[PDB]
Paper text:
Actin is the constituent protein of microfilaments with essential roles in central processes in the cell, including transport, cell division, and motility. Here, we analyze phosphate release rates and high-resolution structures of wild-type and mutant Plasmodium actins in different nucleotide states, bridging the gap between structure and function in understanding the polymerization mechanism and the instability of the parasite microfilaments.
This mutant was severely compromised in terms of Pi release, with α-actin levels of Pi release in the Ca state (0.27 ± 0.03 × 10−4 s−1) and no activation by either Mg2+ or K+ or by using a higher protein concentration. Moreover, H74Q did not form any long filaments, even though its elongation rate appeared rather similar to the wild type. In this mutant (MgK conditions), the Asp180 side chain is oriented away from Gln74, which interacts with Arg178. The conformation of the A loop clearly connects to the stability of long filaments in PfActI. This is evidenced by increased proportion of long filaments when conformation 1a/b is favored by mutations K270M and A272W and, on the other hand, by a complete lack of long filaments in the 2a-favoring H74Q mutant. Conformation 2b is counterproductive to Pi release, whereas elimination of 2a by steric hindrance (as in the mutants A272W and A272C) or by charge neutralization (K270M) favors Pi release, suggesting that interactions of the A loop with the H loop and the P loop are required for native activity levels.
Numbering used by the authors:
A (entry chain A): 6 to 39, 53 to 374
B (entry chain H): 2 to 125
The structure:
């Protein structure tokens, strides 16, 4: 019997079957009302007011979240939840009561036979073929740095960053306005998101790149809009992702990702830091910028002691590493013994989820 | 506690035990092929040593071939964590990459580490 794997993202839901190499269903985590779910709601942005049930990785609107899960099972996968185990993902440091609430909905509303809740960052490390390392996960809503040693995350060293892809899209939109283009609406927000993914990159040295880009026109690139018009983008290509390293660009007091990663490793016992510096694993869609590995290696090497060897790992398929890791875990011969059964829930209630 | 018939045999006496990841399961390697590794596969290795007092010491290695698929290397890592837990966390875990193995791991095989082309098909 094949389990279903569902990764609950702030931007997108990734859903599919255990044993596949990639999710078969990816759609936006949106619910619109004049109820439409996913892409249905994004095409109809006029009559509908859109709501995001997941905020910075945490479920905040349970009614709408149940509508998203219904859409996942029936409209997207065409699967009877009563006949498949379900593996669900959660963000690091997810509130305890929300893990229980998610468990109650699965057994009482969808009547699943068994389920399991896994931490997103740990799934990503397993997908890279590792048991020890530090995962930098940055998606649409939130970024985290999660040290993991011999299979288990270290909660005292997990650090959170209020800066991710959605903040970067709004920044590119603002500086393209300063450039002379008039992107503003929610629909245009989706086009600027495509520009970001297609033309942006991370400079190895920001200050030098600013002078390089002005001394020639090789920085410029053209982008065709859906209507057919063409625009040109210059130094906004590397200024936008730079906010990951200098959050002040966005009016935030937070430290950049390189400083955050460094502070996370310092919170760990000195005897394991070498294994952490040598296994910095990137995960999530916002780590997909060209040049990110080389910039991250330079900045962390500048902060870390010289006796440590810094190695940043950038898997080509890291945009879905969380889901891939769940697909592998839930396929193992030993997984039958790891999950919560409908029997155990009927006797213990939703609290059984924590000792499992 | 998670188990598996191969878990019941592991670390009961001093010696060397090698398993191969085969479509999301852990399968023992025939004893005479120990030391020959398919470049397309991943393996789990447990070295057990007896101590002066009489207690046992555990070293867990997961070896990854240059051509092994993502499902096999990911499964090898998870099985390694699960076997360590079954041993009450007493084992030390080591990641070994084809061609860059630690001196300790290479030293388990007096005839030397050898590689073969091919392997078992992926679970994906
Ligand atoms: N090639 C790319 N370059 C840069 N950013 C990208 C690229 N591809 C996707 N993104 C951004 O990655 C983000 C989505 O990644 P992800 O799908 O990992 O978010 P999530 O997992 O849905 O959110 P969270 O995990 O924080 O809840 C979006 O903001 C998207 O714009
Ligand atoms: Ca193989
Ligand atoms: Ca251990
Ligand atoms: K994230
Ligand atoms: Mg995510």
């Amino acid at each position: 019997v094949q389990a279903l794997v569902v990764d609950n993202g702030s931007g997108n839901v990734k859903a599919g079957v255990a044993g596949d190499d990639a999710p078969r269903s990816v759609f936006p985590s949106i619910v619109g009302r004049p109820a439409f779910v996913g892409d249905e709601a994004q095409t109809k942005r006029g009559i509908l007011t859109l709501k995001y049930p997941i905020e910075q990785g945490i479920v905040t609107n349970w009614d709408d979240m149940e509508k998203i899960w219904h859409h996942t099972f029936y409209n997207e996968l065409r699967a009877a939840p009563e006949e498949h185990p379900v593996l669900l993902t959660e963000a690091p440091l997810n509130p305890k009561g929300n893990r229980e609430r998610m468990t109650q909905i699965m057994f009482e509303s969808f009547n699943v036979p068994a389920m399991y809740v896994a931490i997103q960052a740990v799934l990503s490390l397993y997908s890279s073929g590792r048991t020890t390392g530090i995962v930098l996960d940055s998606g649409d809503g939130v970024s985290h740095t999660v040290p993991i040693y011999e299979g288990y995350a270290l909660p005292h060293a997990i650090m959170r960053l209020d800066l991710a892809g959605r903040d970067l899209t709004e920044y590119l939109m603002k500086i393209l306005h300063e450039r002379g283009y008039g992107f503003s609406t929610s629909a245009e927000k989706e086009i600027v998101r495509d520009i970001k993914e297609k033309l942006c990159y991370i400079a190895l040295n920001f200050d030098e790149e600013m002078k390089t880009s002005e001394q020639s026109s090789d920085i410029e690139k053209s982008y065709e809009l859906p209507d057919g018009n063409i625009i040109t983008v210059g130094n906004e290509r590397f200024r936008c992702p730079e906010a990951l390293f200098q959050p002040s660009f966005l009016g935030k007091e937070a430290a950049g990702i390189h400083t955050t990663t460094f502070n996370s490793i310092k919170k760990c016992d000195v005897d394991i830091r070498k294994d952490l510096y040598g296994n910095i694993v990137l995960s999530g869609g916002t780590t997909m910028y060209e040049g990110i590995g080389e910039r991250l290696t330079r900045d962390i090497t500048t902060l870390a002691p010289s006796t440590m060897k810094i190695k940043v790992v950038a898997p080509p398929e890291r945009k879905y590493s969380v889901w891939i890791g769940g697909s592998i875990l839930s396929s193992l011969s030993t997984f039958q013994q790891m999950w919560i059964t409908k029997e155990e829930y009927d006797e213990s209630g939703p609290s059984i989820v924590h000792r499992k | 506690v998670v188990e598996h018939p191969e878990f019941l045999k592991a670390g009961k006496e001093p010696g060397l035990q090698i398993w191969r990841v085969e479509k999301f399961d852990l399968v023992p390697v025939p004893p005479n092929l120990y030391g020959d590794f398919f470049t397309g596969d991943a393996y789990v290795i447990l070295k057990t040593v007896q101590l002066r007092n009489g207690n046992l010491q555990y070293d867990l290695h997961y070896w990854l071939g240059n051509e092994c698929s993502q499902d096999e290397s990911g499964a090898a890592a998870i099985f390694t964590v699960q076997l360590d837990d079954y041993l009450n966390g007493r084992a030390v875990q080591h990641r070994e990459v084809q061609g860059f193995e630690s001196s300790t791991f290479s030293g388990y095989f007096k005839s030397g580490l050898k590689y073969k082309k091919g392997g078992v098909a992926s679970g994906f």
